[PDB]
Structure formats: C-alpha cells, structure tokens
User: What shape does this take?
Amino acid sequence: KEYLTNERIRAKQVRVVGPDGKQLGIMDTREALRLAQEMDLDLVLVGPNADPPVARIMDYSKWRYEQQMAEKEARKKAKRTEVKSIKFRVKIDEHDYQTKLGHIKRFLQEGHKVKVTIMFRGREVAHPELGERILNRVTEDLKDLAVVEMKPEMLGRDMNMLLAPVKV
Amino acid sequence: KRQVASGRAYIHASYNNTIVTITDPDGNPITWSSGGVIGYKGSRKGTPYAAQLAALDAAKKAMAYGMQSVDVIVRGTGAGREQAIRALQASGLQVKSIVDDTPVPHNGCRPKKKFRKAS
Amino acid sequence: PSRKAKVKATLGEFDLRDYRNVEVLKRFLSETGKILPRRRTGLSAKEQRILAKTIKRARILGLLPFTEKLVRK
Amino acid sequence: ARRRRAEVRQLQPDLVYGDVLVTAFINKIMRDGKKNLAARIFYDACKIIQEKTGQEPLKVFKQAVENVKPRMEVRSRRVGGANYQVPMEVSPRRQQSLALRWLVQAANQRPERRAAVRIAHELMDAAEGKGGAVKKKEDVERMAEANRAYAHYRW
RNA sequence: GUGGGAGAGGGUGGUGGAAUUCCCGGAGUAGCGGUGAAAUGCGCAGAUACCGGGAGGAACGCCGAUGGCGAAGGCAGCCACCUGGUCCACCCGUGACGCUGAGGCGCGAAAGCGUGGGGAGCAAACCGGAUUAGAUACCCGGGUAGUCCACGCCCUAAACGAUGCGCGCUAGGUCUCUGGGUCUCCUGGGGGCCGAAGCUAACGCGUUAAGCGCGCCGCCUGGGGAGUACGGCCGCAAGGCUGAAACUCAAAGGAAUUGACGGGGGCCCGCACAAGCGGUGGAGCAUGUGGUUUAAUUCGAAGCAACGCGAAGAACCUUAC
RNA sequence: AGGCAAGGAGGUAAAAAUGU
Ligand SMILES: [Mg+2]
Ligand SMILES: [Mg+2]
Ligand SMILES: [Mg+2]
Ligand SMILES: [Mg+2]
Ligand SMILES: [Mg+2]
Ligand SMILES: [Mg+2]
Ligand SMILES: [Mg+2]
Ligand SMILES: [Mg+2]
Ligand SMILES: [Mg+2]
Ligand SMILES: [Mg+2]
Ligand SMILES: [Mg+2]
Ligand SMILES: [Mg+2]
Ligand SMILES: [Mg+2]
Ligand SMILES: [Mg+2]
Ligand SMILES: [Mg+2]
Ligand SMILES: [Mg+2]
Ligand SMILES: [Mg+2]
Ligand SMILES: [Mg+2]
Ligand SMILES: [Mg+2]
Ligand SMILES: [Mg+2]
Ligand SMILES: [Mg+2]
Ligand SMILES: [Mg+2]
Ligand SMILES: [Mg+2]
Ligand SMILES: [Mg+2]
Ligand SMILES: [Mg+2]
Ligand SMILES: [Mg+2]
Assistant: This one.
C-alpha cells in the first residue's frame, strides 16, 4: 500500500515514471529526486517489486488523498441496508400488531432485510399453531412490499423468519 | 528550503486530538504535526501518548528547517497538552517560555449542548 | 483558604476611582488580565466592587490589560 | 495482602558460599521440591563455569543476574473498555526474582542434554550480554517503550 | 423637608476587548472533526491548526458571592442621560391623612403568534449516521423556525420562601451586606445560618415565625373524573381565565421509621483478582452422572452447596430393579 | 518540607425484555 518517497529510498538505480505517465528510464535515485524537486513534486516508490524499483514523480500526498477517497467510496457503495429485527409475541393484540407491521413496512421501504421473530415464554407447546399463524398473517399483510427470504426457524425460546424487499 | 532557526509553537489542545503547529517569529507556519500524522486514528488521537508523538514529530520537522529558538504557546486543553509540552522540552529545541492562551470567550455565544450543562 | 500577603496591605494610601493611576491598579489584576478575588485583595465588599468598576473602566480606556497569558505553568 | 504488607521470606544463606540470592536461585531451579538434586545441579553448573570461563562461579552468577534485571515492566489493565499494557517501575527484590525466573526458564529452554550444563551455559550467556534470559529482558524493555503510551494510568 | 448613601432597578443614546463564524490575504500539508467506540461530515478547488486585516450578529469572562437591586416576573461590559423604589441621621414640618383590598386598571419569564428587519453561534421540527430487538430517543454531523431588535398581541409557570399583605409583642448568638455613631463596641434597615419559649402530623419554624395576637383580603372542603365538558368572556390563532356534574373508588395523601432495594457512595474484608507455583480441558484409563440402550440398567441427590456423592466394599449376597 | 482547602485541569462514571 504505502511506499518510500525521495529520501526514504536507499536503493540506488530507480525506474522513473512521470506525473501522468512519462517513462524516463532506469535512472540514478538522486537524479530522480532532483527531477522531483524541479517539478514541485515527489518521487514515490510505486513498485518496490519490479525492474530496478518502479518510482513515480507524483504529489505523494495527493495520491494518498485519492486512495483514501476511493476507499471511502468503496465503503459507501457497500450499502448501509442491513438486517432489522422485530420481536413479536403470542397473545399479540390488534393496534400493537398494526404498529409493528407499519414499522416493518418502513424498514422495507428504507431498503433493509427484516428478522421477523416471535419471542415465546410460558407454554411454548401450543406455539407453532398460534405463532406460525401470526407469522403467516404478517406475510399475507406484506405480499406486495415483502418477499419471504426464509421460512420459520425455531432456535431458542423463539422462532425467526427473515423478509426481503419485493423489488430492488 | 526556506529555513528559519526561530519562532513559535502553537499547541491547539482538544480532547479528541491535540494538534501542534510550528510557526516562524512572524506567525507564518513552517510545519505542523497531528494524530492521523502519527498513524493513530479515532480514540488514541487524543490519548496523551499520541499528543506526545505529534509534538516529537513536529520538533523533528522543525529541525529539518534548522529551528531551535522556540517560543511555546498552548491553546485549550486536551488529554496531554502538558504531555506535549514535556515532549517538546525533551526534544532538543530551545524552549524559551511555555505560555497559556486558551480561546476562552468573555462570555460568548451559546455553547453546543455538550459544553452546555455547565451553567 | 488564601493568606500570603494582601494587595490592600502591601499598598499604602491610594484613591480607588482614579483609573489613570494604572501601575497601582496593575497589582489587583492577575498575571493573566484577570481580577483577583475578595480573599486576595483584603477589601470590604463595597470597596471591592468599586475597584472592579474602576478596573472595567480602565479596560474600556485600554491602559490595563484585558486578557493576557500566563508564563511557565 | 489487604491489611499488612505481606513480608518477604528471609532465606537461610548458602551452605558452601554464603549468599541468599544463590539460595533463591536454587529454589527457583528446584521442581517437585527436590532441593538436594537441584542444589547439586547448581554446584555442578558452578564447577562447569569455573572450568570453561576461568573465573570464580559466584561473581559470574551475579553478573548474569545484573544483566537480566528489568527496571521498566509491563502490566495489564482494563480502562474504558480495551486492555492497555501499562509501563511501571519495579521494586528491587521483585526485579531480582523476575530475573531469576527468566534465567531458570532459559536454562530449561536450551538444546543440550544435562541439567547442570544447560544452566551453566545460560549463566555464561547472561554474563556475556546475550542468551535467552537477556533476550527476554530486552523484549520486556522494548514493550515498556512501544507502550510508554499508557504510563499516565499510574497504578 | 433637609443632609446624605447603597445599588446588575428600568428605559433611551452610545461604545470596549475576549470569543465565535464568514470573507480576502498569507505561510503551510494529509487530515481535521467526532466518540463509550465509530460512522456520516468537511478536506487537495489545499480543509484543520497559525498570523494579518475586514465583515458582521449575539452575548458580557474575570469581579461574582452563600452577595446587591426590584413588588413580582427578572436583572450583570462600561459610559452618559432620563427616572422608580428604598435606606438612614436631624427629629424639623403636617396632624390619623392610615391598613387592606371585591371588582378595576397596569405590569408580567420562557415559549408562542402577527408585522417589518436582522441573523454569528446555538438550535425544536426536519434530513443524516450510529445505537439498538425497534430509535420517531439519550450521542455525534448538519439543519428550519425561533432565539435578537422595533411595533403589536399573548398571558401561563415549581410566576416557590410551594409561606398573602400590615403592625405590635415575644431569649440570645453567629456570619453577611449596607447606613449613622462618643468606630476594638453600639444602633438602624436588608440577606443568611444556629437556636430560648411556644408552635407544629412530623419535617421543621423560630425577630425575615409556620409563636402570640388583631386587621383585611384570597382560596379550601376526599381522590379520580378534570382544569376537562358546558356556557360566558378574552384572543389573529394556540390557548387562557372562569368552572362543574354524571359516574367511579374506598381511597388519593403527607411526614416520618424500620426494613428491603438502588447500573447511589464511603469504609472495610476473604487465595476474590492481581504477584506466583502447579494443575484441569487436550491423551489414555479410573470412577460418578447426564443422555441413550435395555427384560431391568433400582432409587435418590441438581448452580455454588448433585456429579470418587448416599455406598466406609454390587460376582452371589449386598439389592431395593 | 508536611496539614487542610478553593480553583483549573484531565481521566473514571456511558452497556440489562424472556419462566413454575
Ligand atoms: Mg433626600
Ligand atoms: Mg484561507
Ligand atoms: Mg416633629
Ligand atoms: Mg400641631
Ligand atoms: Mg395597597
Ligand atoms: Mg384584583
Ligand atoms: Mg449545530
Ligand atoms: Mg438510524
Ligand atoms: Mg434518526
Ligand atoms: Mg442534534
Ligand atoms: Mg417573532
Ligand atoms: Mg409573557
Ligand atoms: Mg424557590
Ligand atoms: Mg421563582
Ligand atoms: Mg401557587
Ligand atoms: Mg430584597
Ligand atoms: Mg438582621
Ligand atoms: Mg422546644
Ligand atoms: Mg432554625
Ligand atoms: Mg437573629
Ligand atoms: Mg401550620
Ligand atoms: Mg392550562
Ligand atoms: Mg368554551
Ligand atoms: Mg412519603
Ligand atoms: Mg427508609
Ligand atoms: Mg481467576
């Protein structure tokens, strides 16, 4: 990633590439340094791997900045949309359920993938009939906004689903 | 490639990063060192050690321009302003006086809600 | 609890209101351009207040320092 | 610990020479609690030293001890969330003990066959300014220079 | 009245630096900023940090108080002007002119709204990021209104000393500010703290009474319902003031006191961790259990404090299966 | 040099829905 500029270079003969891409040849490192000084720029060791080290008369700092920007871009087109969870229950009544649904819808609209999970507690024996039914109802409610990425999965004292947005 | 031998040492000290600028006697700076400059990023940026490192780096840079005769001024307070000062003293640069000039308002505007709750 | 010397007890006879008398007024200002407390001057409250006012007046004129810089630290 | 300062045990001094440090070293060497086996081992080491590097075998030991001694040490502390390697100063006795331990470790971390010989070799190395124990000491010192960072977190 | 005095009392006209942002100028380079961490956010069109100057708007650091003022809301750079209150000494003048105050008229923080301006910061809403099960929130990055001013309007509030105003009486102290004095101590007016009596549900209060009285005014008659509905009035709107009942419950409360609790703290201790030596896990077996298999794997023991335990002796016996 | 304190700092304090 990071290289050796001007004075940090101790290897004696360097291959000198120019500001846009000016091939000046296998030259003295001192000569390269001098050239860099002349153009108000820096000779940066861009390949310590090839034929008598590949060194670039560039604004080192500028290049670094560019690289940083690129990296930032890479981590800003890697998408902020992740997995939003919502923990339901057994004896869920109406208004609260609707609120939950609304929340889910909002999340979907934003772009997210949704861990839809029913927290069980007491009996968790009559669980699938009610919990599963609830889940089914939820799915039905979101048939145009949501697609079922994965079907009910009981792990702990709970069962999880996940729902993905219908069209990207 | 300009060279000076003399000037000031403005240590802006914030809790997130202690930044050190070195200036010529006129007030026109030669170099500066910070926390991202000693690689450190985020939390350590304001850790006293980082400040010390920055100070050292700044001193080194100054030395690459012949500087010795150094007046030192600190502004605000960070984790190591004192640490930075100590580092500078150690370095081998003729430390004339270390002077406090915090940018403290004479009852200025409304501070941000963090620097509010002070009443 | 403050008691080394007092700026009233070190200073003799002087009028308070006269801001022009600046060096005598330079003793109640801190090393930084800041006023010393009641427990540093030695005055009565009224007197202290008057002194403060005078200092302010002086500042407005300019004679005495407004804010300065501590040394060594 | 909590109440009193938990005193250091003053050992019975050496049966042949006359120094407590030597006794301590012997004890350190000793595993399973077999003093007579490892005391003999120590004596053998001494003899070896006398033979090869033409010197009294107490002075050499002392030199070795001096060489392996740390002055700056590294502790572990949780502050804020993360753990920080904290550099701090050692009290003389403790430092000596540490050095002894290191020496013992080095003696056990060598490639040759017999117990005494290895020990002797390690001692010689320590005296010289190299070996295993010395390297360890150096490493420790370095750690208390790459992490002189978190020195203001004084214990 | 005279003679004084304290004061951020208020209003009008100014101005003084610190700060901040913003603009130009420089010099200077790879990051600043942010945090429990970080991420957006800005930065090579050169940002941050540093000096020069300007542009502005706010708000007054130190003094600064546990202080001073006002009737209350409130009030702080300094000046000038206009001006309120008040406090004292002379006891000089008047001769009960007083005290309160239903209504009334005024004032009335902050937000709010209308009209015009200005607008630096801060910053509801709002847009971002994290944080998270969720985040419409605490935390950061911006960001409108608004904050500021002029004119109007609003009128509420923990508009609290949760104590109406007035006088008299009833131990002191102590600290504070302010005045006069025959000024190491008195005597007046404020502000605090400790307390005699007494009082109080207790907490507390205690010459600044919640004590004794008297004067007048304001409310109050369980809570919730409910400051809501209704009407009425006010207001550009928001709302306000004024103010129920049906029903409902047998409470709602306050003080204190135990105890318990607290992601309150302090003081301690324990092989608790550190400092150190040696292990367990990993290997094999030994055993005891869980599980599973079985005709039955007898039963119990259950985190610590069940698990080489009851079993300190299972081939039969023991032994219950 | 010690004894108490006032201030200025600068660190810690920041993370917790599941039963019979
Ligand atoms: Mg008069
Ligand atoms: Mg510029
Ligand atoms: Mg008379
Ligand atoms: Mg008469
Ligand atoms: Mg009246
Ligand atoms: Mg009225
Ligand atoms: Mg902001
Ligand atoms: Mg978010
Ligand atoms: Mg958000
Ligand atoms: Mg914000
Ligand atoms: Mg307005
Ligand atoms: Mg109002
Ligand atoms: Mg109050
Ligand atoms: Mg109030
Ligand atoms: Mg009230
Ligand atoms: Mg008053
Ligand atoms: Mg009084
Ligand atoms: Mg009594
Ligand atoms: Mg009392
Ligand atoms: Mg009294
Ligand atoms: Mg009462
Ligand atoms: Mg209301
Ligand atoms: Mg109505
Ligand atoms: Mg109670
Ligand atoms: Mg209690
Ligand atoms: Mg442990």
Residues 87, 89, 119-122, 156-158 of chain A lie near RNA strand F (CB under 10 Å from a C1'). The helical segments of chain A are 29-38, 60-74, 94-110, 127-141. The two ends of chain A are 35 Å apart (CA to CA). Chains A and D do not touch (no CB pair under 8 Å).
